[PDB]
């Protein structure tokens, strides 16, 4: 896919707001992936012994690790799909060491739609949605088609 660049321009316009606080955004969305789908928090061996949403907004290790997640995200998006560079280390940690499930990547982009809706009404109608997920559709295609280069493909 290709995004316009008034699409890119929607996608931009609400991560700056994001970019005013991004470890509360980075909580915020891994509390709702860890709470929605639970399976994803077993992934993590830094934190699959948190237990409740008080622990989870109470552990500095997640929270530092929230921040360096949507760090990468936003220089993602930034590139506006030239985003080749970016990903290569990206899909080759998530596919080999990890073993990260593209449906996983999807669980993930669901709780960045559901935490901008929540936090940024104002700046995220229906248009800014859609073109949010383009962006994030463009990324999950991207990095599936890297996974099947190195092997993994999941
Ligand atoms: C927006 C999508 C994602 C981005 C941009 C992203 C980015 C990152 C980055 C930058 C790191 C640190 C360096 C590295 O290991 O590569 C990381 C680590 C990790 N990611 Fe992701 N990630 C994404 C989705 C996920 C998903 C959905 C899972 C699990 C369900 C996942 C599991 C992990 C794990 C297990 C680690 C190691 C964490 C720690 O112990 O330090 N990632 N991720």
Request: no cysteine.
């Amino acid at each position: 896919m290709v995004l316009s660049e008034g699409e890119w321009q929607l996608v931009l316009h609400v991560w700056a707001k994001v970019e005013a606080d991004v470890a509360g955004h980075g909580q915020d969305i891994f509390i709702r992936l860890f709470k929605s789908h639970p399976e994803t928090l077993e992934k993590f061996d830094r934190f699959k012994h948190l237990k409740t949403e008080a622990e989870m907004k109470a552990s500095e290790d997640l929270k530092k690790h929230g921040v360096t997640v949507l760090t990468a995200l936003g220089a993602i998006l930034k590139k506006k799909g030239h985003h080749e560079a970016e990903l290569k280390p990206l899909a080759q940690s998530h596919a080999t060491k990890h073993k990260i499930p593209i449906k996983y990547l999807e669980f993930i982009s669901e709780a960045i739609i559901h935490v901008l809706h929540s936090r940024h009404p104002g700046n995220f109608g229906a248009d800014a949605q859609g073109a949010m997920n383009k962006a994030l559709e463009l990324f999950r295609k991207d990095i599936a088609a890297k996974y099947k280069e190195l092997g993994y493909q999941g």
